[PDB]
Amino acid sequence: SLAPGKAESDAPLVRTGALAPNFKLPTLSGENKSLAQYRGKIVLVNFWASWCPYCRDEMPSMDRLVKSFPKGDLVVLAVNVEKRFPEKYRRAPVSFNFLSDATGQVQQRYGANRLPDTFIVDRKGIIRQRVTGGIEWDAPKVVSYLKSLE
Amino acid sequence: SLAPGKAESDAPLVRTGALAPNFKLPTLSGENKSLAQYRGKIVLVNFWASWCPYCRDEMPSMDRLVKSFPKGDLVVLAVNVEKRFPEKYRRAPVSFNFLSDATGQVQQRYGANRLPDTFIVDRKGIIRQRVTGGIEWDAPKVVSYLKSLE
Structure with a gap:
């Protein structure tokens, strides 16, 4: 056992x-x-x-959340991390902006090595919270929290 | 504060x-x-x-270590993580095999996000230890440890 x-x-x-x-x-x-x-x-x-x-x-739950806010006030950038984007999601009736990160670079820069991983960015560009893992995005506490950012 | x-x-x-x-x-x-x-x-x-x-x-210390073992018995694969390989090291009189990891993939697969990071791989391919950070590679305890792998 060698010391670091x-x-x-x-x-x-x-x-x-x-x-x-x-x-x-x-x-x-x-x-x-x-x-x-x-x-x-x-x-x-x-x-x-x-x-x-x-x-x-x-x-x-994320789709319901986005659709419940005034149009465009809450934006989801849904960065898919797979080598090839999953074709079926191209026709999903959801209010997410699907993106692909083919080089892996954006995922790496966010340190997003567990999925799902969501960063809540406020109006001024500050990361206000990281939420690692699946949560109920339309839960009252969550909606309240987001509203507290306007 | 949202729960994960x-x-x-x-x-x-x-x-x-x-x-x-x-x-x-x-x-x-x-x-x-x-x-x-x-x-x-x-x-x-x-x-x-x-x-x-x-x-x-x-x-x-790593150069002295490698040169002290019988030729080729200990191999250093010195994977440089920079976008461009540092030209000056091309003419270094050291017994390391310098490699470049331009895509970043090998570094990522090893989870080597702090440098230096060295993985000691035995004769059968098993990672026997990870050493994170700079150590004295020719220290008696280290040489002894490596010899204990043959």
Whole structure:
């Protein structure tokens, strides 16, 4: 058993209370969307995979949440982490902006190594909370929390 | 403050006591080297960056260690994690096999997010220890430990 020595991090930073890491990724239509283009709105940056049951399970509550807010006031950037985007989700009647992260870079920069992983970004771009795992996104406490950001 | 839900890992596995993750990467000469080609020898899989003082500081002790073993019995695979390989190290008189990991994939598969990070792989391919950070690789306890693997 050998003792460790001094080391330095080789990861960029992602911090609650600080401005979110910028990113720009391809949509389903091959248009690009960025986090920064949504400044002024509340954004859920969600990392997910079709094979993960907890990712699939949380989608209905997130859809109800988004559709219950005034149009465009809450934005979901649903970043799929799979090598190929799951074709079936292209025709899902949900109010999410589906993105693909083919290089893996955005997922890595967010340190999103467990799925689903959702970062709640406020109107000014601050990560106000990380929610790891599937939750009930339309629960009263959650809706209240989001409203407390406007 | 929202409670987390159930999540699943999106990382492949890297475990002390289990066979090491395979990889094949380009050398300085544009030849490819793999971990598996060194089965039968003790291998130090080392992730490093030129800008990290602890990476630079540990190199002399690792060079002495390798040169003190019978030729080829201990192999260092010195995987540089930088976007571009640091040119100056191409002419370093050291007994390391320098590799580049341009896609970032091998570093990610080893979960090597602090540097230096070294995985000691035995003759049969088992990761026997992870050493995070710069250590004195020619210290008697270390040399003894490596000899205890043959």
